[PDB]
Structure formats: C-alpha cells, structure tokens
Amino acid sequence: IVEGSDAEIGMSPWQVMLFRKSPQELLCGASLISDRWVLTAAHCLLYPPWDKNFTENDLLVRIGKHSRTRYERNIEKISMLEKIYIHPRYNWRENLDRDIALMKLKKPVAFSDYIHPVCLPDRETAASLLQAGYKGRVTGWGNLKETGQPSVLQVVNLPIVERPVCKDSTRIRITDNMFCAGYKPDEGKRGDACEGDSGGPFVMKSPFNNRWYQMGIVSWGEGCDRDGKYGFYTHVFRLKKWIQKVIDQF
C-alpha cells in the first residue's frame, strides 16, 4: 500500500495473507468470507505469462495477522487449502477480466477478536454504494512504493472513480466486471495498492446497517500510485452468482 498508514489492531479482521510454503514468502492478499472460505484474485493463483499455476499444497493462508513477517503466536491462525476454484472465464490473456478465485480451507477457522468474516454485497448494497466519489478501504502488506516493505498491515481509503475516467486512463480494455478507484492528479491526496496487495479486499461500511461489505478485489494497476493512473478492482457483486454457485455446490 502506497501512502497509507498502519492499521489498528482488529481493524480488518477478514484480512488474509496468501503465503507460499517454499520459499516462505508473501504471495497476495485475500479475505475471509466464512469459517471455511477465502476470496482472492485469480491472478494470485494462475498467471501463465509469469509461469504461475499454484496447487493447493503450495500455499497456506494466515488469518488474524497484523505484523507482516512475525509469527503472531496465540493470535494468527494458519490454515491449509482443501481446494482452489478459479472463475472459468477468468481472462488472464488480455485484461484480467473476472479476476476472482475462492479457496476452501481444510478445517474451519475459529473466529476471534482478530478473525471475523466480511459481508458480500447484495444487489441493493452495490447499487447504493458503488458510486463515483464514494470511498472504500484497501488493506495489505504489499510494497510501500512502486520502486520498501511494511512492518504491519497498511490501510488506505480511496474514492471510486467515474467509469469514463477509468477508461480514459489506460489503453487496456476495461469491462463491467472491473471498477477503478484512487485520487485524480488535481485532488492532492494520494494512495494506491501495490505489489503484494493484490487479491486483498476493497471494503465499504454501509451507512444503512453499519456492516462492512467487500465490494472489490485488488486486481491490477499500471505501476503504483502514479499520477493519472488508478487501481482496478474486481467487481465482486457482478460475480456473486459464481461465488454462490461454488459455495452451494462444494
């Protein structure tokens, strides 16, 4: 996260770290949506241009974390993966359209002060909140600058951007399964996701029921925190029927 701040303890209890077993390293962010299911970006698991195609046994998820590098004894919980599910129309060739994946854990994780699931939006919450100017929150342990790394989880709040501005910021084809967020050059304020944050959540706190909803998944950007560029996020609600199909059947 570029131009964010340290998270408060328990501020993002749905945060998940995707962790490679060997070499031990941070792969991506992710989020907890129930005691057995973790949501992330498809590109965190499958990206053939970079020879990336992880299997379940390659990975762990670490839940309840604050410190990036510490083993947070008596706080974090480490879970093994039973199965990975990638959206069948995830477009890794062109533009990361439908950049979404689910991971089922081998055993349910116990909730605590530090471990708690985020809500997924329904149609009405998406319609109400996914509007240009409305701010969401992005969290992660990724790089502090495009070109170092944080001691603890970082947090930044960023406004959703008008779709024509998103499209006009890039040569990549932007689809209805994506939205973009970030400050414009003239807005003064700054901030973005960066390498290591992808797969993590873009959340909004509903003013109707005071619950946090995951509206986006950190998907891609051209650099980090560049003037006139924006971060692109998977539109979770637009892919919710696939989420529900997977959970209901597996």
Binding site: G10, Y114, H116, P117, C119, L120, K135, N157, P207, R211
Partner: peptide, 30 residues
C-alpha cells in the same frame, strides 16, 4: 454469516476506527 462485517473490536463494542468517518462523509446519498 448473520454476524458478517461487524468487527469484534469496533462495531461489536460501539468503537470507531480512526478513519471510517472519512468513508461516511463520502456517502452523500440517502
């Protein structure tokens, strides 16, 4: 979950985090 999105150390204790008000202030409708 019936309890999703309600943080033990914040909403469940009626404590506010340091920047959630910035989000609320951006939500102009309703």
């Amino acid at each position: 979950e019936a309890d999703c999105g309600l943080r033990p150390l914040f909403e469940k204790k009626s404590l506010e985090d340091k920047t959630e008000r910035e989000l609320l202030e951006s939500y102009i409708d309703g």
